[PDB]
Amino acid sequence: QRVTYRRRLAYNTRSNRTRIIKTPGNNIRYLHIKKLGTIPRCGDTGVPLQGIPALRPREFARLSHNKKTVQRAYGGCLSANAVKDRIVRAFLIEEQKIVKQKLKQL
Amino acid sequence: KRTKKVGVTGKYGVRYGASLRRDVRKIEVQQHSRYQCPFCGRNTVKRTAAGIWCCNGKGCKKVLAGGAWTVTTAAATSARSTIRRLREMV
Amino acid sequence: LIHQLSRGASQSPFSKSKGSVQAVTFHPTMPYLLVATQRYVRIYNLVKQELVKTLLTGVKWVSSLSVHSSGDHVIIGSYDKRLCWFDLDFSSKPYKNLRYHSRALRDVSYHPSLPLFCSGSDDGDVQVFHGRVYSDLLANPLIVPLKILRNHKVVDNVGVLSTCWHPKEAWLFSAGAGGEIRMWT
Amino acid sequence: KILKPGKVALITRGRFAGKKVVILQAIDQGSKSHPFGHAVVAGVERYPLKVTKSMGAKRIARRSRVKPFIKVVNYNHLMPTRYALELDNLKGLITADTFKEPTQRSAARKTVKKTFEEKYQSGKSAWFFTPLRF
Amino acid sequence: PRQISDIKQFLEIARRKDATSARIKKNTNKDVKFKLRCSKYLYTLVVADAKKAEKLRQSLPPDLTVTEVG
RNA sequence: AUCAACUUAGAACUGGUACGGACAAGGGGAAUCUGACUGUCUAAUUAAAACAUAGCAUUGCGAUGGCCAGAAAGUGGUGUUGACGCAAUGUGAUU
RNA sequence: GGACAUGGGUUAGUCGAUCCUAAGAGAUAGGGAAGCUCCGUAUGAAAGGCACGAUUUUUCGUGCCUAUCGAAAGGGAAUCCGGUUAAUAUUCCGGAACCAGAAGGUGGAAUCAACACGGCAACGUAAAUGAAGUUGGAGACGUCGGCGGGAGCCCUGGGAAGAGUUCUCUUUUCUUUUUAACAAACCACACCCUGAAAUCGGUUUAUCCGGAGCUAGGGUAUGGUGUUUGGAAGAGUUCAGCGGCUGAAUCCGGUGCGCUCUCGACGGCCCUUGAAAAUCCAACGGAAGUG
């Protein structure tokens, strides 16, 4: 059997996303569903972050704090490899500026 | 050998003329070829748009500015060498 | 690992185990096996090899567990200086949480017959509680302290490590870090 | 041999990423529970806050309080540095059993805290106690 | 929309002031379903033994409004 | 061992030699004139050999500028532009 | 009769508008124009905030840095099932949920080592303070081409209920055999660890990958239109009886270059590279702090 849109929006668009259900009354019916969420992406490398669900922007507000982040420095904003590069590059350049200062001070 | 002479241009068929398609052939094999990445050495550099050359090597991910069809042009290479020798002299 | 003596064999009943395993116990009425992990206590039915119940201890670290002979009550002794009484028909959350111990709790033991149980910790003090259970639903189990056994030395930050109950009467076997076994009658 | 007891290193992976730690004991040969070349370290989780000559004594103590942590870390996750910290009073306190029984772990954390407090007051290892910005 | 596997906590939610009514369901496969209408959720409890179901029913406080199969 | 899917080859036998059995469903070739091609237009008599096009070439202009607009303005476009660009044209693929 | 006459009829926190911005319209500042009005849209504008302090000569000091309109097909908070009416329904009724905001209360956790622990790690946990300032992410994006997964329909093997045909034949022909939002548990391409690889190996329909650490062994993450229950059989459907009521049945499986929508991993194309903003989250930093 055939179905119709539940809303007054024809013209399947990105917001007119639908699903077929069979009801307890043995009816084939559309179900208007929302778009899919996105996993937050890394700030430096652009890879999606690991440990966070894939939700719409406002649906992120219902989660608990630990469910949206990762327990690490920059966790939930940068990937683990990106953070590791941040740490080692930070330390190495700091040792350089120390060794350059010791060179130029004498 | 499916095509003895036309090569990648076989998609264009019989249209556009022989010479006007041969120069495209040389440019198009350059444009779609894979180039060795100067930073990681992996043969993973491919053109993205005109002038943009992106490396898909896991851990490199470097983008490059280059020629429209080839990563390095003769004019850019000449400019790099002359500027290098000028800086060394200065 | 589960070892069958009659067949003289050993096996691992878990296809995949989540979390580090701290302690194990056998149910006294129904053929269940209790796994005390870092934070959770999971009940597994051996005959059909499935997960029966999960207990959320709400505690960073679980040290030891004991089971009432009725099979519907569990005590969780934790490294968080806490005792958690779980009643299997009460809730998934601990029915009672007790924080009398001043140091990390090592072991908890239930008397097999009498409604008495004890918690031994590294502070050197043994807490003796009376845990009364009725099968009637209206009557929640009565958990009350009874005695605070003291005057046990602590060696290398280790106090009362193990406590055991007499099978018949209310006698306590407490082992210390100094090699002393105390008889609390 | 550059991972020796008393050597300051940086944790690059885990919850304590980017924290400065001191090599407490190296087991590079491996172990049954840790088949890799691990090394147990003691470090700082909450670095003491910056202090000012204008600050009163109560806040000077209040900011100078430091929260330590003890952790066994893989060699690949540690970044050794040239700095060295003199681990007085901190030679024998860590053992496989000290991790097995957290009561010894809790005692180790307290002793590590009081040593770090005193060393910070003494004004030694300024680089060790300042947070690393990245 | 809330399945309860613990008898006591089903009783406690029944004693809780949010509870308004309880319902009894007797299925053909001979299991008893105790459903408890609350303010926000409907807590249902499935029991496979008749006498445990009966002792549970009398364990409900008298003030609660209990209804048979609908 | 049992279980599940339609795609090809070959054998006979058979029928008013019938056989994509209705439906559906290219006429083909040898040449001239012409526009290279796909595309566009006179809605309501002209669909073309016209227009467009890629390609070719020419011209103006380095910004206090070329080209265009406005009654004027402390105004607007090309222009989030810079000669591998914008503007103005003529021819019209290739050989 | 869509005619004619008299009446009746459209119920929403969840569907739209409203909110957001697009191309673009457009006041103000200013400058033109005899003028009607024109140009203009952060411009040649004094274009508005925020925090400290015994209260400061009881006449206020000290620091800190953009209108509006414009989309019922774009972006976007949250609702499903069964039923009901002569005509309304995701709107009413019965049942079952959800989102946003507000306030205190119960319970639990952290806390005098003020701001939790575990795992080597990727990360996990029922909680786990964070001002100003900065920054990141989601919203947020073309097109075509196969390949893999899911749901609904289609096809199909038995069971059971009726009904069709029956001169003959057909353990058969047909109809029915249903399970919503939502809550809960469970469910492996990227990544981590061990390890060191040339007799080079892994692997795809499609040749990409590896000493920048392959294969392999063990992990972590993502978790629905999947599964098991709750919803929930009491509903819907079919059938057999009674005078509104009472009985049954709604069951067990297979399949695929199948269609429709979606989803995942990829591939190709471009002198073509394929919106914004509102909104929401997170991070670096460390103001501040019996209760």
PDB file of N, CA and C (backbone and C1' of nucleotides) in Angstrom, chain G residues 158-160 169-173:
ATOM      1  P     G G 158       4.629 -26.407   1.271  1.00  0.00           P
ATOM      2  O5'   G G 158       4.649 -26.817   2.804  1.00  0.00           O
ATOM      3  C5'   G G 158       3.544 -26.538   3.645  1.00  0.00           C
ATOM      4  C4'   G G 158       3.901 -26.745   5.094  1.00  0.00           C
ATOM      5  C3'   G G 158       2.762 -26.597   6.085  1.00  0.00           C
ATOM      6  O3'   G G 158       1.933 -27.738   6.161  1.00  0.00           O
ATOM      7  C1'   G G 158       4.596 -25.359   6.851  1.00  0.00           C
ATOM      8  P     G G 159       0.407 -27.612   6.640  1.00  0.00           P
ATOM      9  O5'   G G 159       0.496 -26.733   7.965  1.00  0.00           O
ATOM     10  C5'   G G 159       0.830 -27.355   9.216  1.00  0.00           C
ATOM     11  C4'   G G 159       0.390 -26.480  10.359  1.00  0.00           C
ATOM     12  C3'   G G 159      -1.062 -26.032  10.315  1.00  0.00           C
ATOM     13  O3'   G G 159      -1.919 -27.047  10.843  1.00  0.00           O
ATOM     14  C1'   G G 159       0.330 -24.174  10.770  1.00  0.00           C
ATOM     15  P     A G 160      -3.415 -27.241  10.262  1.00  0.00           P
ATOM     16  O5'   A G 160      -4.251 -26.110  11.000  1.00  0.00           O
ATOM     17  C5'   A G 160      -4.006 -25.792  12.361  1.00  0.00           C
ATOM     18  C4'   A G 160      -4.598 -24.454  12.705  1.00  0.00           C
ATOM     19  C3'   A G 160      -5.926 -24.154  12.038  1.00  0.00           C
ATOM     20  O3'   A G 160      -7.012 -24.752  12.718  1.00  0.00           O
ATOM     21  C1'   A G 160      -4.488 -22.297  11.797  1.00  0.00           C
ATOM     22  P     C G 169     -11.200 -37.283  -9.682  1.00  0.00           P
ATOM     23  O5'   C G 169     -10.105 -36.206 -10.101  1.00  0.00           O
ATOM     24  C5'   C G 169      -9.024 -36.555 -10.952  1.00  0.00           C
ATOM     25  C4'   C G 169      -8.059 -35.407 -11.119  1.00  0.00           C
ATOM     26  C3'   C G 169      -7.567 -34.756  -9.836  1.00  0.00           C
ATOM     27  O3'   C G 169      -6.509 -35.472  -9.223  1.00  0.00           O
ATOM     28  C1'   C G 169      -8.221 -33.083 -11.370  1.00  0.00           C
ATOM     29  P     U G 170      -6.355 -35.478  -7.623  1.00  0.00           P
ATOM     30  O5'   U G 170      -5.843 -34.011  -7.276  1.00  0.00           O
ATOM     31  C5'   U G 170      -4.556 -33.574  -7.683  1.00  0.00           C
ATOM     32  C4'   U G 170      -4.421 -32.077  -7.574  1.00  0.00           C
ATOM     33  C3'   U G 170      -4.538 -31.493  -6.174  1.00  0.00           C
ATOM     34  O3'   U G 170      -3.320 -31.562  -5.453  1.00  0.00           O
ATOM     35  C1'   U G 170      -5.866 -30.236  -7.679  1.00  0.00           C
ATOM     36  P     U G 171      -3.063 -32.727  -4.378  1.00  0.00           P
ATOM     37  O5'   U G 171      -3.015 -31.966  -2.981  1.00  0.00           O
ATOM     38  C5'   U G 171      -4.197 -31.740  -2.229  1.00  0.00           C
ATOM     39  C4'   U G 171      -3.880 -31.491  -0.777  1.00  0.00           C
ATOM     40  C3'   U G 171      -2.656 -30.634  -0.502  1.00  0.00           C
ATOM     41  O3'   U G 171      -2.909 -29.252  -0.635  1.00  0.00           O
ATOM     42  C1'   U G 171      -2.588 -32.537   0.869  1.00  0.00           C
ATOM     43  P     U G 172      -1.710 -28.243  -0.986  1.00  0.00           P
ATOM     44  O5'   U G 172      -1.656 -28.225  -2.580  1.00  0.00           O
ATOM     45  C5'   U G 172      -2.781 -28.610  -3.366  1.00  0.00           C
ATOM     46  C4'   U G 172      -3.322 -27.453  -4.164  1.00  0.00           C
ATOM     47  C3'   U G 172      -2.826 -26.087  -3.706  1.00  0.00           C
ATOM     48  O3'   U G 172      -2.762 -25.202  -4.823  1.00  0.00           O
ATOM     49  C1'   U G 172      -5.169 -26.194  -3.448  1.00  0.00           C
ATOM     50  P     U G 173      -2.033 -23.775  -4.694  1.00  0.00           P
ATOM     51  O5'   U G 173      -3.221 -22.734  -4.890  1.00  0.00           O
ATOM     52  C5'   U G 173      -3.779 -22.531  -6.178  1.00  0.00           C
ATOM     53  C4'   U G 173      -4.957 -21.593  -6.152  1.00  0.00           C
ATOM     54  C3'   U G 173      -4.857 -20.387  -5.240  1.00  0.00           C
ATOM     55  O3'   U G 173      -4.030 -19.354  -5.743  1.00  0.00           O
ATOM     56  C1'   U G 173      -6.995 -21.348  -5.031  1.00  0.00           C
TER      57        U G 173
END
